[PDB]
Design an enzyme around this catalytic site. Structure first.
Site, PDB file in Angstrom:
ATOM      1  N   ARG A  78       9.184  40.118 -18.506  1.00  0.00           N
ATOM      2  CA  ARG A  78       8.394  41.270 -18.616  1.00  0.00           C
ATOM      3  C   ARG A  78       8.016  41.781 -17.174  1.00  0.00           C
ATOM      4  NH1 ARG A  78       1.758  39.397 -18.180  1.00  0.00           N
ATOM      5  NH2 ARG A  78       0.546  40.998 -19.132  1.00  0.00           N
ATOM      6  N   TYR A  89       2.175  46.751  -8.796  1.00  0.00           N
ATOM      7  CA  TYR A  89       0.645  46.379  -8.520  1.00  0.00           C
ATOM      8  C   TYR A  89       0.129  46.740  -6.891  1.00  0.00           C
ATOM      9  CZ  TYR A  89       0.598  42.514 -11.673  1.00  0.00           C
ATOM     10  OH  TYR A  89      -0.032  41.955 -12.440  1.00  0.00           O
ATOM     11  N   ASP A 115      -9.315  32.588 -19.639  1.00  0.00           N
ATOM     12  CA  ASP A 115      -8.512  32.570 -19.685  1.00  0.00           C
ATOM     13  C   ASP A 115      -7.257  31.401 -19.082  1.00  0.00           C
ATOM     14  OD1 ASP A 115      -7.390  32.980 -16.775  1.00  0.00           O
ATOM     15  OD2 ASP A 115      -5.856  33.627 -17.631  1.00  0.00           O
ATOM     16  N   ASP A 120      -8.014  34.213 -10.481  1.00  0.00           N
ATOM     17  CA  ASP A 120      -6.885  34.914  -9.352  1.00  0.00           C
ATOM     18  C   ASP A 120      -7.694  36.242  -8.455  1.00  0.00           C
ATOM     19  OD1 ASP A 120      -4.305  34.834 -11.627  1.00  0.00           O
ATOM     20  OD2 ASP A 120      -6.105  36.232 -13.051  1.00  0.00           O
ATOM     21  N   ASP A 152     -11.681  35.970 -17.157  1.00  0.00           N
ATOM     22  CA  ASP A 152     -10.411  36.938 -16.310  1.00  0.00           C
ATOM     23  C   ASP A 152     -10.918  36.925 -14.537  1.00  0.00           C
ATOM     24  OD1 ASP A 152      -7.855  36.034 -15.259  1.00  0.00           O
ATOM     25  OD2 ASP A 152      -7.328  38.105 -15.955  1.00  0.00           O
TER      26      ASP A 152
HETATM   27 MN   LIG Z   1      -5.534  38.252 -17.176  1.00  0.00          MN
HETATM   28 MN   LIG Z   2      -5.320  35.302 -14.909  1.00  0.00          MN
HETATM   29 MN   LIG Z   3      -2.371  33.916 -12.571  1.00  0.00          MN
HETATM   30 MN   LIG Z   4      -0.562  36.012 -17.556  1.00  0.00          MN
END
Ligand SMILES: [Mn+2]
Ligand SMILES: [Mn+2]
Ligand SMILES: [Mn+2]
Ligand SMILES: [Mn+2]
Ligand SMILES: [Mn+2]
Ligand SMILES: [Mn+2]
Ligand SMILES: [Mn+2]
Ligand SMILES: [Mn+2]
Lengths: 282, 282
Positions: A78, A89, A115, A120, A152
């Site tokens: 991916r 990114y 999630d 993150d 998330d």
């Molecule tokens: Mn995500």
């Molecule tokens: Mn995440």
């Molecule tokens: Mn992550």
């Molecule tokens: Mn992921």
């Protein structure tokens, strides 16, 4: 001293990156302390994907010592697609170790389960990071991304060695020195998966980036969630591998997990298919 | 058949990219026919800089056979800076051979002397080109950029092999399949030099991207100027090295100039200073 053990050629199915603690493989999710300086709130960030790159490298939950590996879809590597005006990114992207977004629970602000992964972090310094690198950063704010209906949170932070580090201390400084970066962060996370067949994402708090206080309340909650987890008291661990080599009072603690790990076998980067080049105009 | 002969390593001072026509180095400026299909307005573009890259590679006017080398700014290798939201060049970048923006004459439309080089092309296809690549493209529009008070037209073009070529016929289709690429091109060229501490560029016609027909008119004028130059009739040739291995009716025509270029000796890409990573918020 945290280093890196690269097994394989970047951009291959075989590519694994383990974090080392003074020469010995540790668990990227568990054996790296959330705080580098707790007093001050200086965090340890594990960098997964460098800025402007596309491979979707992730800390793998179900592998032992949770190495960083490239995500796969239907048997294939991916990669995230470039969406105008962005190129891969637009942040150094990674996570805070020892945090867990509880899948089993509906966090009350966003009203949806977490999630199932470490919280993150978006790191906005000027140097492009490296994969499996541990960086010390300061949280500046947070965004509530509902990614495919799932909680998330995205923590906005900066490398403390960054030249503007000193001048950035709360979310509002992000806009004074990186004008438009916060709106591009909202648009990038709404649409990146559209070129993949996914619906468009949505943000809680109308895309409001919360301040360092609120953010700090969220990192703690998540860190507490991981506490129930590695301890053995999580309602449902979802088969995450809890093997570690530094939390001895843990059921899952296990020295020798580290000797188990294979030596680095770094190889020259494999090429990425020229379709990745494509620039999508969403 | 056009290939490329690399000497030394990328991002170095000893790096030269020569163009080959059937294995014989030829002048990248004079010996590559402007037209691929005249009556269809299909030109041969020499590619200098792949998209989303920063080394400022240029066809060198002053070197025999005009190789593509890296530009120099104050004794140092030149690299264009990242200006949010962009990453290096937002277009594959090059020029049309057999053109010349006349330094010695003030062009009537922008009111300024030419910038002393082949007319410039922005190839907007989806594939990232490579340095020295001769590609066949189709003009679609032209933008009148005044680069530090000099006439520096930007031709907007698309590789004929692009999966979208067929739908792109004139300037207005560019905003059709690539919404916003036109607004970002204008901005990119106004601001790209600010980080070097130079002033903002301005565009004639209020930045209007002129139609395909105006474009061909301008490409063609430039071809005439090159005719004076190479024929030997320029008021001032500016030290531009006019050696060539294919125009025998030209005074500077000399075969044997091709045999004088050393063999390829490419090395792998040298590392680029990390300051280049920085993103400027202009
Ligand atoms: Mn995500
Ligand atoms: Mn995440
Ligand atoms: Mn992550
Ligand atoms: Mn992921
Ligand atoms: Mn130049
Ligand atoms: Mn040029
Ligand atoms: Mn110029
Ligand atoms: Mn020019």
């Amino acid at each position: 001293t945290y280093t890196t053990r690269q097994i394989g050629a970047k951009n291959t199915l075989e590519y694994k990156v383990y974090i080392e603690k003074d020469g010995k493989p540790v668990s990227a999710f568990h054996d790296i302390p959330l705080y580098a300086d707790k007093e001050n709130n200086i965090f340890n960030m594990v960098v997964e994907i460098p800025r402007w790159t596309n491979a979707k490298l992730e800390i793998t939950k179900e592998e032992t010592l949770n190495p960083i590996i490239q995500d796969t879809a239907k048997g294939k590597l991916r990669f995230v697609r470039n969406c105008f005006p962005h190129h891969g990114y637009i942040h150094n992207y990674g996570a805070f170790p020892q945090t867990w977004e509880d899948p089993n629970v509906s966090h009350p602000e966003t009203k949806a389960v977490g999630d199932n992964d470490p919280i993150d972090v978006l790191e906005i310094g000027e140097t492009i990071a490296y994969t499996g690198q541990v960086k010390q950063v300061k949280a500046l704010g947070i965004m509530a991304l509902l990614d495919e209906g799932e909680t998330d949170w995205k923590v906005i932070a900066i490398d403390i060695n960054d030249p503007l580090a000193p001048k950035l201390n709360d979310i509002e400084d992000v806009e004074k020195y990186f004008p438009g970066l916060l709106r591009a962060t909202n648009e990038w996370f709404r649409i990146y998966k559209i070129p993949d067949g996914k619906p468009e994402n949505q943000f809680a708090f109308s895309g409001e980036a919360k301040n360092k206080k609120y953010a700090l309340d969220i990192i703690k909650e998540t860190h507490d969630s991981w506490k129930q987890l590695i301890a053995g008291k999580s309602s449902d661990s979802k088969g995450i591998d809890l093997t570690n080599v530094t939390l001895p009072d843990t059921p899952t603690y296990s020295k020798a997990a580290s000797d188990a790990i294979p030596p680095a076998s770094p190889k020259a980067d494999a090429p990425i298919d020229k379709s990745i080049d494509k620039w999508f105009f969403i």
